[PDB]
Design a protein around this ligand. Structure first.
Ligand code: HEM
Ligand SMILES: O=C1N[C@@H](Cc2c[nH]c3ccccc23)C(=O)N2CCC[C@@H]12
Ligand SMILES: O=C1N[C@@H](Cc2c[nH]c3ccccc23)C(=O)N2CCC[C@@H]12
Ligand code: NA
Length: 393
């Protein structure tokens, strides 16, 4: 009877997640508000490990057109596959994905990412008055990450178009179904027209590595790779960096510790990934056969969701789970997932989060110019994001 998701669009997690977690079942039935599909929902760390490390629960099967699902419209342009990352690994591009997303990419890019973070923060510090950390720090930094490491250099109008498509398509509510579908169409048509151009510009952005890779990727396939990098890399990084700055600004003692002890910043990055919520939906997998999870039978074809926010706030895994405690020394967080589908963007994500944390830690006194309650949130996004983050020294 419980409908999903829980409309917890700000950083305050829905109390439903703790209620289910403490329930007597390790897996609980819900219904998709957007489709009426019955779904299963996992909220406990121990059960989540088991689900996401069992390859008979398939991610691709849960993404496929026609699967039971939490999202109101399919997350693809009509007529296209929608499984880009599978398709690129499919065509033998694991090596390419590693060179473009792995440690060597971070080594190529970490210099300018930290230069840009400081330059942005320095300019804001030079301002008389308040400023907006979302529009004035996160947007330029996340846009530069997308252009330089993922797609190739975008104009401001192209960045805005891709951001709008992602915000419109990656939603539970607040737009009509047809608008959502059309956002995916527009984004596909943008890369049908522009992916080869972007791939051909100088740089080592991933889309170039993909387009130049031996396998002849079609325009449609290269367009799907472009769309994947937007949906997976852009609203995620923007939303998270926004949420992480909010967390830091609400924990000046933690920031002061990092200012005095910069060697502690990596531990703080990992705690932000646990503590700061991002997705308002759930990672999900389809039972490819009849399966059982901690005693509950899951029939073939049924989809099991795991809320990574719920798992990350599981008190059986993390003591005082709702406390931001850098260095807490508990189990691995789920902010990048678990198992085979662990976020491949995790190296670049950690790079940009770390650069942001260090930029903040170097400048104590940075604070919200309004109360946390006065922050306004985009309602219905998959990936939480505030409308603005008024801030000042
Ligand atoms: C910056 C913050 C980011 C966060 C918090 C994050 C988080 C995640 C998580 C939790 C998943 C797993 C979803 C699942 O289990 O089904 C995932 C998957 C993925 N991420 Fe990230 N991500 C971020 C950034 C990025 C970036 C920058 C890229 C690439 C440029 C990226 C590329 C991907 C891809 C392609 C997948 C799909 C993996 C698969 O389904 O096999 N992510 N991400
Ligand atoms: O590569 C994928 N993986 C999963 C999880 C995911 C990772 N990043 C996402 C961004 C938005 C929605 C889902 C995800 C998925 O649902 N996918 C549909 C869009 C991208 C595709
Ligand atoms: O809210 C969602 N989360 C991702 C998984 C994910 C969980 N946490 C993430 C963080 C970054 C990227 C993806 C994820 C997913 O598969 N979805 C299908 C529709 C809703 C959407
Ligand atoms: Na798997």
């Amino acid at each position: 009877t419980l409908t999903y998701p829980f409309h917890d669009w700000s950083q305050e997690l829905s109390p439903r997640y703790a209620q289910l977690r403490a329930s007597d079942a390790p897996v609980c039935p819900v219904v998709s508000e957007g489709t009426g599909d019955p779904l299963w929902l996992v909220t406990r760390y121990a059960t989540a490990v088991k689900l996401l490390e069992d390859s008979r629960f398939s991610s691709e099967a849960a993404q496929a057109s026609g699967a039971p699902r939490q999202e109101p419209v399919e997350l693809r342009a009509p007529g296209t596959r929608g499984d880009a990352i599978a398709m690129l690994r499919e065509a033998g591009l694991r090596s390419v994905l590693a060179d473009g997303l792995g440690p060597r990419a971070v080594r190529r890019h970490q210099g300018w990412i930290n230069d840009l973070a400081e330059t942005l923060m320095s300019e804001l510090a030079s301002r008389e008055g308040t400023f907006d950390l979302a529009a004035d720090f996160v947007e330029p930094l996340s846009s530069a990450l997308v252009s330089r490491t993922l797609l190739g250099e975008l104009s401001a109008d192209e960045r805005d178009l891709l951001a709008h498509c992602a915000d419109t398509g990656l939603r539970f509510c607040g737009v009509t179904h047809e608008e959502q579908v059309h956002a995916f169409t527009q984004m596909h048509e943008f890369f049908l027209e522009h992916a080869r151009r972007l791939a051909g510009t100088p740089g080592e952005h991933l889309l170039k590595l993909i387009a130049e890779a031996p396998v002849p990727l079609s325009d449609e396939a290269l367009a799907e790779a472009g769309s994947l990098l937007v949906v997976a890399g852009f609203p995620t990084s923007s939303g998270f960096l926004c949420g992480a700055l909010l967390t830091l600004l609400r924990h000046p003692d933690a920031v002061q510790e990092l200012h005095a002890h910069p060697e502690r910043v990596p531990s703080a990055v990992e705690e932000l990934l646990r503590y700061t919520p991002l997705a308002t939906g759930s990672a999900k997998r389809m039972a490819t056969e009849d399966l059982e999870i901690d005693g509950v039978r899951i029939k073939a074809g049924e989809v099991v969701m795991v809320s990574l926010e719920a798992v990350n706030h599981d008190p059986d895994a993390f003591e005082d789970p709702d406390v931001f405690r850098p260095g807490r020394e508990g189990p691995m967080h789920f902010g990048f997932g678990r198992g085979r589908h662990f976020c491949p963007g995790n190296r670049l994500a950690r790079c940009v989060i770390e650069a942001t944390v260090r930029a903040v830690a170097r400048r104590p006194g940075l604070r919200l110019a309004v109360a946390p309650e006065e922050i306004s949130w985009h309602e219905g996004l998959f990936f939480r994001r505030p409308r603005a983050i008024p801030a000042t020294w």
